[PDB]
Structures are given as C-alpha cells and as structure tokens.
PDB file of C-alpha atoms in Angstrom:
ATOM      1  CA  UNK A   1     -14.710 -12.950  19.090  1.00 19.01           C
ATOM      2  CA  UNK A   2     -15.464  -9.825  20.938  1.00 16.88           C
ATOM      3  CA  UNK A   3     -12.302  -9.190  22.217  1.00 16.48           C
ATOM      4  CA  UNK A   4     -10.821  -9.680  19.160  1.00 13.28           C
ATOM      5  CA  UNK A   5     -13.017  -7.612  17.175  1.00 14.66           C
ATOM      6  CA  UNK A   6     -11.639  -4.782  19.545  1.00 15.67           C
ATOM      7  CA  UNK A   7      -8.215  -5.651  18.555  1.00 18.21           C
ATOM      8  CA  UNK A   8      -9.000  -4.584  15.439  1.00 17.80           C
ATOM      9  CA  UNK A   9     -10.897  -1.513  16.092  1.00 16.79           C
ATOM     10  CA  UNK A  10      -8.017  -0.415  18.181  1.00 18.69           C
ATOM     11  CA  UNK A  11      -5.486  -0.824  15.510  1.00 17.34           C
ATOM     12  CA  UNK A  12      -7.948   1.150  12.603  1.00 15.05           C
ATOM     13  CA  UNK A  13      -7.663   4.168  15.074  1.00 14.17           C
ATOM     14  CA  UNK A  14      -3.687   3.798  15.166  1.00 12.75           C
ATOM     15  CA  UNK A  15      -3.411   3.782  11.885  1.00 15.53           C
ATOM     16  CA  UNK A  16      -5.667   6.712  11.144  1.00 15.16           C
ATOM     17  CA  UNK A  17      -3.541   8.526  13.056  1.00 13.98           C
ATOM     18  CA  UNK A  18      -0.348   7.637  11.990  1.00 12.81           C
ATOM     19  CA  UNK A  19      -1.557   8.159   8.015  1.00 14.56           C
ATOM     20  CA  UNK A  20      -3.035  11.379   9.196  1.00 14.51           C
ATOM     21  CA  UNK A  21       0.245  12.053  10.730  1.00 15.01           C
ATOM     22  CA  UNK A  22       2.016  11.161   7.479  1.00 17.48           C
ATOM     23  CA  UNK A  23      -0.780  13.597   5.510  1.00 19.86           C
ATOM     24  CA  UNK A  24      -0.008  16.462   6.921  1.00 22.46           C
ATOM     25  CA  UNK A  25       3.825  16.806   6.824  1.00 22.22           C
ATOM     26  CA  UNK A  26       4.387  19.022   3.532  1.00 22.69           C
ATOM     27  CA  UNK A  27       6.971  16.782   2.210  1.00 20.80           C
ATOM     28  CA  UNK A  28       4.907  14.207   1.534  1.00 21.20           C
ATOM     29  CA  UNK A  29       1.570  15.761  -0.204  1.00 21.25           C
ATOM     30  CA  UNK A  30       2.119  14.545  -3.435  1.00 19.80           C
ATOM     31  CA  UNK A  31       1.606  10.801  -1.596  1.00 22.29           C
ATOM     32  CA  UNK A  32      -1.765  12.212  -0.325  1.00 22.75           C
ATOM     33  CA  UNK A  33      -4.019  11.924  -3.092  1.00 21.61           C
ATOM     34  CA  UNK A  34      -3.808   9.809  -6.406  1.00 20.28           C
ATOM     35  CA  UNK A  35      -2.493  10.842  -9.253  1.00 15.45           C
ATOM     36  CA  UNK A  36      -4.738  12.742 -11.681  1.00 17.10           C
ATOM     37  CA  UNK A  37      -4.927  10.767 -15.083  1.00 19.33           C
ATOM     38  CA  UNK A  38      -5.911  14.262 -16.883  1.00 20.30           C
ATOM     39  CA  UNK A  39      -2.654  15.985 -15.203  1.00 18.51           C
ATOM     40  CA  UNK A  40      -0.431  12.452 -15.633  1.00 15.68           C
ATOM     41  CA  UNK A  41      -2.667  10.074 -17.808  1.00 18.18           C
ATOM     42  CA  UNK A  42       0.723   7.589 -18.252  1.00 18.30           C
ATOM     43  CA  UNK A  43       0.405   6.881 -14.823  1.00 20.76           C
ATOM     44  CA  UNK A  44      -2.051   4.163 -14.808  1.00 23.00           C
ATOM     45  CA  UNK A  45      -0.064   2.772 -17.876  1.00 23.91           C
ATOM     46  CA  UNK A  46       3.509   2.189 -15.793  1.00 21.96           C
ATOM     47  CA  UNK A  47       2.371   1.481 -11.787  1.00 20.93           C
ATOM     48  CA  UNK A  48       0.392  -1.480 -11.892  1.00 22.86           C
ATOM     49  CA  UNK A  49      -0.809  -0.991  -8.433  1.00 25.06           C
ATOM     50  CA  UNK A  50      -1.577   2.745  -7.199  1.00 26.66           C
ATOM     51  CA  UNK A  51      -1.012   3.653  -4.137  1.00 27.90           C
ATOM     52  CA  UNK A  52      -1.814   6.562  -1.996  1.00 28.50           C
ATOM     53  CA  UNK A  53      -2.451   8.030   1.799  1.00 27.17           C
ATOM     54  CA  UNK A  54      -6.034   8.476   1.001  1.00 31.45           C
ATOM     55  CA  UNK A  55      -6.289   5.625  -0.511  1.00 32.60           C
ATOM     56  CA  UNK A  56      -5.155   3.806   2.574  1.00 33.85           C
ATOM     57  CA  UNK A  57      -7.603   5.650   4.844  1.00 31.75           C
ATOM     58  CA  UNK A  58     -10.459   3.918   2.585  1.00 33.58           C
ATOM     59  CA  UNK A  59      -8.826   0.928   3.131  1.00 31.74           C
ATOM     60  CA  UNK A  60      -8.167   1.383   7.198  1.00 28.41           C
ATOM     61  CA  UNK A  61     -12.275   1.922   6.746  1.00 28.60           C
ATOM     62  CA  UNK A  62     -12.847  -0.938   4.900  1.00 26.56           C
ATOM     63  CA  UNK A  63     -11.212  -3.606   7.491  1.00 25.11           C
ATOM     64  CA  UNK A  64      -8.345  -3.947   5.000  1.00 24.21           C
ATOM     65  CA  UNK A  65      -6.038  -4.102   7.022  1.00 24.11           C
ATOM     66  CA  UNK A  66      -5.743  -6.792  10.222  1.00 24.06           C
ATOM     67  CA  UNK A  67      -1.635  -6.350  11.286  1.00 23.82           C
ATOM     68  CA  UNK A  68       0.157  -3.398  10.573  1.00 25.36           C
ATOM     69  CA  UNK A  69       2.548  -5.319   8.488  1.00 25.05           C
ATOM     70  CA  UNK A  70       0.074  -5.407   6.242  1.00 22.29           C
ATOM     71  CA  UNK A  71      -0.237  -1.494   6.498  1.00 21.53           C
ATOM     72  CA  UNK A  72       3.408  -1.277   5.726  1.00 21.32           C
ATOM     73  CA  UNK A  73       3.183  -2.823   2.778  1.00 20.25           C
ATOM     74  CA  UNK A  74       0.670  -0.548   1.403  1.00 20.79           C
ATOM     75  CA  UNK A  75       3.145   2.196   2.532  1.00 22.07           C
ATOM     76  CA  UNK A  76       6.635   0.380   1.118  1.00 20.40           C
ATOM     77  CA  UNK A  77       4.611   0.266  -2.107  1.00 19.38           C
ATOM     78  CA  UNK A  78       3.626   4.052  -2.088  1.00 15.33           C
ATOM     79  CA  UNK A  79       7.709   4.289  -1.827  1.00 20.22           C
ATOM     80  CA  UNK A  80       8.728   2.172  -4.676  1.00 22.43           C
ATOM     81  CA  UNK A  81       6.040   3.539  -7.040  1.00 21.29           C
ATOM     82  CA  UNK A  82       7.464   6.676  -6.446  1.00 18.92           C
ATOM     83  CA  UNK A  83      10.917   5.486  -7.180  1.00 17.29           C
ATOM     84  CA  UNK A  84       9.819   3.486 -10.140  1.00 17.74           C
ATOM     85  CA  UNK A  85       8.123   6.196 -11.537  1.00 16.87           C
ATOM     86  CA  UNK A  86      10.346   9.004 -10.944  1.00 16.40           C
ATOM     87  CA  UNK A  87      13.663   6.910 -11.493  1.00 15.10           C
ATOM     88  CA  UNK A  88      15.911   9.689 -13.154  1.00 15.12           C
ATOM     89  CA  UNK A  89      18.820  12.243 -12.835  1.00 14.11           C
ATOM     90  CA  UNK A  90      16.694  15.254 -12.953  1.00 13.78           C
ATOM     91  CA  UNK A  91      15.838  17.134  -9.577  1.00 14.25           C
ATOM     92  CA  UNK A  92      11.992  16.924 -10.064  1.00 15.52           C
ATOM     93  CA  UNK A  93      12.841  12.938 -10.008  1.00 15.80           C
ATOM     94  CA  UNK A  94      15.305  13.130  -7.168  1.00 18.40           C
ATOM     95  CA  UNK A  95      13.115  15.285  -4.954  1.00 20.68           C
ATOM     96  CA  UNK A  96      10.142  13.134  -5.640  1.00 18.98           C
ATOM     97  CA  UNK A  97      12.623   9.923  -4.262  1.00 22.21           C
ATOM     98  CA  UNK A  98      13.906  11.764  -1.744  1.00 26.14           C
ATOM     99  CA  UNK A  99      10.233  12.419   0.084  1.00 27.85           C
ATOM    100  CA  UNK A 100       9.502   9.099  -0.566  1.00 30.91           C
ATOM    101  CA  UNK A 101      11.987   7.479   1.280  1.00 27.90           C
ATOM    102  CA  UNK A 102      11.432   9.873   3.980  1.00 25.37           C
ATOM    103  CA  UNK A 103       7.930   9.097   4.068  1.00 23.89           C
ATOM    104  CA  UNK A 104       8.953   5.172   4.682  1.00 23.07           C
ATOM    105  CA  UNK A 105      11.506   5.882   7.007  1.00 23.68           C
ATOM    106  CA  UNK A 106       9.028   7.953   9.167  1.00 26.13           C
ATOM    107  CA  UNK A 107       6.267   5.277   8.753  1.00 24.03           C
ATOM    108  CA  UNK A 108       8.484   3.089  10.071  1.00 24.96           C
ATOM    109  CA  UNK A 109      10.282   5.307  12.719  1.00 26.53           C
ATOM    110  CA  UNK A 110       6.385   6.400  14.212  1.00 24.26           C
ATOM    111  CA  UNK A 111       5.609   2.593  14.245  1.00 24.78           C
ATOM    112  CA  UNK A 112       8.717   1.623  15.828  1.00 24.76           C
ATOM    113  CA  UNK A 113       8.029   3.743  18.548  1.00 23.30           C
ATOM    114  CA  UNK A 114       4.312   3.617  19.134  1.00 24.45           C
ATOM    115  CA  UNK A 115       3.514  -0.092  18.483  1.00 27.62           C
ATOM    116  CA  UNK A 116       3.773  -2.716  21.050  1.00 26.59           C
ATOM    117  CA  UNK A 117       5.101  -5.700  19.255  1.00 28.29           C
ATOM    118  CA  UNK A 118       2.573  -7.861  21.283  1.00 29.56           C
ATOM    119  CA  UNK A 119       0.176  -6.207  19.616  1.00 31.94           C
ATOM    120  CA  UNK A 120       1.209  -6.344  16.358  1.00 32.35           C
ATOM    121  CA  UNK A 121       2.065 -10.381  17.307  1.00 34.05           C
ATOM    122  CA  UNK A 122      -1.837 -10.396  18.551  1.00 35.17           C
ATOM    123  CA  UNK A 123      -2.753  -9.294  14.960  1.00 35.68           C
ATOM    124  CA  UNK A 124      -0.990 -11.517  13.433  1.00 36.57           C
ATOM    125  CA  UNK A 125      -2.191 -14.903  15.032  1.00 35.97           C
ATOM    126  CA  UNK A 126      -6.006 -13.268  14.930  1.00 35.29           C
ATOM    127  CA  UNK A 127      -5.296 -13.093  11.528  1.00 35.32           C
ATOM    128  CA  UNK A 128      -3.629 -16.530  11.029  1.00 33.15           C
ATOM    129  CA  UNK A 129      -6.516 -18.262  12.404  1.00 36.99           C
ATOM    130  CA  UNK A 130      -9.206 -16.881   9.882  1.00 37.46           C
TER     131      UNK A 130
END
C-alpha cells in the first residue's frame, strides 16, 4: 500500500543519515569504501562477503533494506570482517578492531536513540507479509 510504501521511504532517509553519520567520523574511513584488490588483492580471497558504508548506501538505494535489523546486519558484518581479517597482535590489526567495534557500538548507540521501536516493529510485519 501507499502508506506503507512511505514507511519505507521514511526509513531509506534514516538510514542515509545515520551511514552518512558513520562516514564521516575519521575513525571509521577505512569502512567507507571497499577494499582495493590492486592495494589488498587477498581480500576477496578470505571475506566471502564484502562489506562497506558505500556499499550500504547502494543498497539503502536499491530498496535493500525493509527493517533496520536488516541494516544492522550489513553493519555487524562490516565489524566481523574487520576482525576476521585483521585478527592479530600487531597494532595495525588492533587499531583496525578497535574502530570496528566502535563503529558497531555507535551504529547501535545512534539507533538506540533515534528509532522508535514501533517503527522498526511496523517494518518488520510490512515485511513479514510480503
């Protein structure tokens, strides 16, 4: 319906702004764009599943994305590529995990904050029924 269909709408511009929100902190600009496979070209060979903020906006775009648990999930996985990727002692490794965890923990934090849960809940049975 109608009124659905601006349920949706509605949520694509909260998410552009929280992943624009995300972009634009300095910790987390290695999350903004994907990885180069001329600059890392083992990449592609260990994360199955790339992730990245850019990436997302596309998605956002495309109507990827009806509920922003399923958001979240695109952002948990930008986290645990990071951590499965960079999983060593060395600080290049631990800074790496460090932002990347931060850059869940504020997804989640800006979400926690800023979404209604009836809306999310609204998502979620719009989505159920299709």
């Amino acid at each position: 319906s109608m009124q659905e269909e601006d349920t949706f709408r509605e949520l694509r511009i909260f998410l552009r702004n929280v992943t624009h929100r995300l972009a634009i902190d300095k910790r987390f600009r290695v999350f903004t764009k994907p990885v180069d496979p001329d600059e890392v070209p083992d990449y592609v060979t260990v994360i199955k599943q790339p992730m990245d903020l850019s990436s997302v906006i596309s998605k956002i775009d495309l109507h990827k994305y009806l509920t922003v648990k399923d958001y979240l999930r695109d952002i948990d996985l930008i986290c645990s590529n990071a951590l499965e990727y960079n999983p060593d002692r060395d600080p290049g490794d631990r800074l790496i995990r460090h932002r990347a965890c931060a850059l869940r923990d504020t997804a989640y934090a800006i979400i926690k904050e800023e979404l209604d849960e009836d809306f999310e809940q609204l998502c979620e049975e719009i989505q159920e029924s299709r």
